[PDB]
Amino acid sequence: PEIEWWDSYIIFGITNLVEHPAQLNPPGVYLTKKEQKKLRRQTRREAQKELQEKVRLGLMPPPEPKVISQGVHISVYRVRNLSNPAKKFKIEANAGQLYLTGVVVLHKDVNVVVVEGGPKAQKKFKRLMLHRIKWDTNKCVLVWEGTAKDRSFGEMKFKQCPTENMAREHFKKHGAEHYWDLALSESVLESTD
Template sequence: MAFSRRLKLDLLTTSDAPKQKLKRRSQNIALSYVTDTIIDGQVSLAEFGSTSVQNRRKAPAIEWWDEPVVENSSYSAVKVENITGNLFIPPALPPATTTYAPPPQEIMLTKKERKKIRRQRRMAVVREIQEKIRTGELPPPPPKVKISNMARVLNEQMVANPTEVEKLVREAERKRREAHEKRNQDRKLSKEERREKIVNKVREDLKKACVLALFRIGDLSNSKLRFRVKTNAVELHLTGMCLMVFGQPGMQLVLVEGPPQNIKKYINTMTKRINWGMPFPLQAQAAPAATGESSQQSDQAQDPSSSTQPSPASGSASLRFPNQPMIPIETNFCKLLWKGVVKKPTFREFRMDCVNSSTAAQNVLQRMGMEQCWKMAERDATSEKVEKMEDKDQTLFSAL
């Protein structure tokens, strides 16, 4: 236990030391508030005194939570009957942002596990049928007699008349085979149903991710190449456009968008399967400068995509795909420039466009919001030219 001197206690009780200490604290708090407010630039120093700050908010006569139990806005009269033992619990407010739990991940089963699940499912169906046969809900099936077991199942009849028994067994086998084929045919989807099923699958995959791929092709004057480019895109249910520019070899663009799996197949087709150096059709080789209707009709017959309708960006109704190559056939190429995920599809179908200048091509892509594709193709073409020049210079230097 610690004792204090009597003199110290007398000074604390008789002097104004505590009051002075409290006053100094209040003045320091006021000065710090004034300093912070002036530093923030909200008010000027002239609005405040040196040591005092006015109270900017007056205390209310009563608090809002006491209004139901007081009268005349005063604590002097209290409604005792309104005071109960119940507690007021305010309702919980919803959060400002709603967070959802991530969906459960699909379990990838092995081939052995999938076979086991299928076997168990089929066994359950067979047990259910057997139980209905035991209870009398279904009639028992006839014995499944085959050529291999007819001597054991129909022993007595086989001895009496083997020819007739064999005929009956073969007839039963034929009926079972026909019933099996009929069930398969009834379960088979029609052509329209199969197409609708594929389209629905593509739509579901597009909701998960939409992938855009950009190709740069050397020359698309060959109608066979244009036919392959469009047909493969349509068969894979892809949308996009094939943009061909006159007088711009190496700047023929193909943009396709769709589900990831379909885009993967299309990229494999464009970069590996199509022979970009294939020769032109025989009619085009026989009449290279043909301008009559016969050559135009043969070109349209070989390539449905080479329509005579004017492109909206061409500005001319006479623009057609040319029949002569813009570059040597053996140097033709197809290069994948970019592939990535986009927010949503831009095109409604796959179409073929033919324009007469790079400006018109940029306008077409700008209307679709794809102007960066042309810039990307130009950069790639420029870098390719620079690399070829460097290789040529290196070859000359090594020869020297």
């Protein structure tokens, strides 16, 4: 290149004006015991009075004697091996039950799990993945945990990929290849030690 578009623009449009351009917006009390009691007492008294007046007007007989919007939380884990069917079923069932979108991509020694949803569901799923599941060298770690403007998959789907390029392009299809890049690089550095 020879000139940047701003430098090309200037060479003159300069004068003592200050801009104010295109404004763009970003993307109860408790009751005390006494008050509680008062409210219940008043409600029940009013009900009794209305029933009594209803009786007095003949409508009833006298009683007888009694004889992710605005931001979605994302998390990314990676596991050594995930070929076990029971654990895959556990992951899928819990993700669907907690309304956690995302994907699981299996690979040689790097099985990456991406989940997306709300904070409480994310915490529940993280607890499940890090404490409830017994992996035993087969370990589980949290690669990343952040937030994004909107969801990026539709629902859980156990895609299978034995070639790194296939996994990378599958991730890129949605627009989330950076997760795969980070997980893969962390895996290489882990393997080199």
